[PDB]
Design a protein around this nucleic acid. Structure first.
Lengths: 95, 114, 56, 274
RNA sequence: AAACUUGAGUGCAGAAGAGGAAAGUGGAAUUCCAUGUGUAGCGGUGAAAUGCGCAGAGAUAUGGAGGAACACCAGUGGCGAAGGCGACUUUCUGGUCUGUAACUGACGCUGAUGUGCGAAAGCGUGGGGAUCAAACAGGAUUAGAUACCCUGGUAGUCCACGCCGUAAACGAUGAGUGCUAAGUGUUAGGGGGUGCCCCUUAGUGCUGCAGCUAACGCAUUAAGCACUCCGCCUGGGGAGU
């Protein structure tokens, strides 16, 4: 019904061990009460076309997350503003 | 209080006031945003003060001294549109007190130490 | 307390818009994803006093 | 918080006790206790100078550090104990080097918290540093009066002060009695407020509970004899019958001020009490 | 029971909603005073103003202050139940809607759980009382007015924390109908394809004609007539006692 395309970017300096626990929390709020997703990915070394906060790198893990309870793209938006973990996210409502 | 004019210009984003008073607290003239009549957010712009103090620094006929001692205070879009307003009024602009209402809360008690 | 645009800005309402001035695409910018929300806020706000042509 | 009692007796009809929930340990340090002789309103001559001061339960003075002159070393809170000679609670602080005394437990303090001291210290609840290093508008307590002499102001339970300014020879600070006065900013002061805020909501209830604290009965001066109190003699219940109420030693006790004039610190007080 | 449909379900793509700004650095005020529209300036009357030393006394362009902090984005908004947000500003919180049906298929009572929700004085008013303001000093008539007006002037208006309940909640005006005129606006978002022909209509403002109603009056949302329990006038009274 209400699909959401979240394309959040992580910090350029984060340990893999902590990165696994960082994506676990993001996936925990995305796959909460039913995942209903398409396919997960894990982009690595790459360059962004636009610059935001003058960084050096940034791990990627953008995955499609279809929802019906409208609670998967809730905390995520707040996570990329209050805490200093996410920088550039996304908020697409297109099916 | 002739041959003297200690004016105080106020710079804000709403109803900018720039009147010219004498050395002693006494309003010799009354003409600004209050005597203007613009509710279109134009009584605090660059052309506001210039036109507001225009008649104020022209209908004086008492003070209008060379010195004005403009005391600009507070942030405003046209903060440099009031200092030149008195310069284009007929007098000039020299004394300027750049001190807005933004105290840093910094005071010192007993000395006699480092 | 965050870098936000005021209502006074009149030239900050038609930066990345089409000739007619319709909804702008998501592949015409080049900043952050939080800048698109402010882009749509400059459209609706400028579509009340007819300051932005609906269809030029 | 506050705990009420069921009315099973006439003495416990309105009796209200305190709920010691902040207390962590129930045993004091054996290397920080001193005996108390209890003068009970008696001077060196042996004559009674102050009245309404009887016996009561036995107590043991606990050395309290009101100086906090241990800068450079850190200290972690151990536990919050109960003190009978004070209205507030004390917290056992453990340092490094050796010193390990008690400190007036602040309002928002928990077990396992680091506390520092000295000019180079963070502005956290429990830290103590000079008044000039404290930002204006901060709530502090346990303030000193003379450089390195120990705190003497804001030491009661719930007491707190607020920094206003530094005049030009002293620091302006508002007290709990709504009275602003200058104070040298070379002394130290703890950050935060004192705990045990529900110590004034306690209701004794029983008249025998006041004897446990050491308070003897107070007789009214209007029911005494003519050669015992100004309002002594009088057939039945008569009024004062004088211009103004007098004290036991024949002295006006209503409005008349007593603050001695021409004081050394009479130019340090800005505003009076409200 | 075998069965598919959109028109409604989340609202399928929409746009203003940010379901929601309490707000530190903030600068603009009736008060003292640094020191000024600084001494007749303001709180200031249907006629009727009270206020600011008598052994020592306000006026605010400011400045060293703001409140229950905040004028404009608060819109015939989405309104989902009587219920539309800020000195820009962040939260998606069930959720309600017009053209559209992706998915199974199957069609009622403003509804027995009317949570007793429910402007209002009173309720959990934490805090509350300041330009002020009932009363109060008062000022005022004519053949008639402690009223009201205004005024120094207590209360009186204020925030989370069981909770708080009559209404012009119904403009004295609640209830499933349609159809023999067109639309169907609102805040601003949408096609046939270029907005020229189309866009039934709903959340909302409703537009009169067949037939009723004694009449008044209900009609692209009649009380004619084909779809629910309800339902009110009973002695005027007495009686809301």
């Amino acid at each position: 019904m209400r699909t959401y395309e979240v394309m959040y970017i992580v910090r350029p300096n984060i340990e893999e061990d902590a990165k696994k626990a960082l994506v676990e929390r993001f996936n925990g709020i995305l796959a909460t009460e039913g995942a209903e997703v398409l396919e997960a990915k894990d982009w690595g070394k790459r360059r962004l076309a636009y610059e935001i906060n003058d960084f050096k790198d940034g791990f990627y893990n953008i995955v499609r997350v279809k929802s019906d309870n409208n609670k998967a793209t809730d905390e995520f938006q707040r996570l990329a503003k209050i805490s200093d973990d996410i920088i550039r996210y996304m908020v697409i409502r297109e099916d | 209080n002739i041959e003297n004019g200690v004016a105080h210009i106020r710079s804000t984003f709403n109803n900018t006031i720039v009147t010219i008073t004498d050395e002693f607290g006494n309003a010799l003239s009354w003409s600004s945003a209050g005597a203007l009549g613009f509710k279109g957010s134009k009584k605090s712009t660059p052309f506001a003060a210039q036109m507001a103090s225009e008649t104020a620094s022209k209908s004086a006929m008492e003070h209008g001294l060379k010195t004005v001692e403009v005391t600009v205070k507070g942030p405003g879009p046209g903060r440099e549109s009031a200092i030149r307003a008195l310069q284009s009024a007929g007098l000039e602009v020299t004394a300027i007190r750049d001190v807005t209402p933004v105290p840093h809360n910094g005071c010192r008690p007993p000395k006699r130490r480092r | 307390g965050i870098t936000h645009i005021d209502y006074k800005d009149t030239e900050l309402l038609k930066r990345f818009i089409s000739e007619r001035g319709k909804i702008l695409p998501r592949r015409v910018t080049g900043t952050s994803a939080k800048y698109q929300r402010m882009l749509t806020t400059a459209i609706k706000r400028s579509r009340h006093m007819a300051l932005l042509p609906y269809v030029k | 918080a506050i705990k009420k009692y069921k009315p099973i007796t006439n003495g416990r009809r309105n009796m209200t006790s305190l709920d010691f929930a902040e207390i962590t340990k129930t045993t004091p340090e054996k290397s920080l206790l001193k005996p108390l002789p209890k003068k009970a309103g008696r001077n060196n001559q042996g004559k009674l100078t102050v009245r309404h001061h009887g016996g009561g339960h036995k107590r043991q003075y606990r050395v309290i550090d009101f100086k906090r002159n241990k800068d450079g070393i850190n200290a972690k809170v151990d536990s919050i104990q109960y003190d009978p000679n004070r209205s507030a609670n004390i917290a056992l602080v453990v340092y490094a080097d050796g010193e390990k005394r008690y400190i007036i437990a602040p309002k928002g303090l928990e077990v396992g918290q680091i506390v520092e001291s000295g000019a180079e210290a963070d502005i956290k609840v429990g830290n103590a540093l000079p008044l000039q290093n404290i930002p204006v508008g901060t709530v502090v307590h346990n303030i000193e009066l003379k450089p390195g002499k120990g705190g003497q102001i804001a030491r009661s339970a719930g007491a707190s002060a607020q920094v206003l300014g530094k005049e030009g020879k002293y620091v302006l600070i508002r007290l709990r009695s709504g009275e602003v006065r200058m104070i040298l900013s070379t002394c130290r002061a703890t950050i935060g407020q004192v705990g045990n805020l529900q110590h004034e909501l306690v209701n004794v209830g029983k008249a025998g509970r006041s004897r446990w604290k050491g308070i003897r009965p107070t007789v009214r001066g209007s029911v005494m004899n003519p050669n015992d109190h100004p309002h002594g003699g009088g057939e039945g219940r008569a009024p004062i019958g004088r211009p103004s109420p007098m004290s036991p030693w024949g002295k006006p006790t209503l409005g008349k001020k007593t603050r001695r004039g021409k004081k050394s610190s009479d130019k340090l007080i800005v505003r009076g009490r409200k």
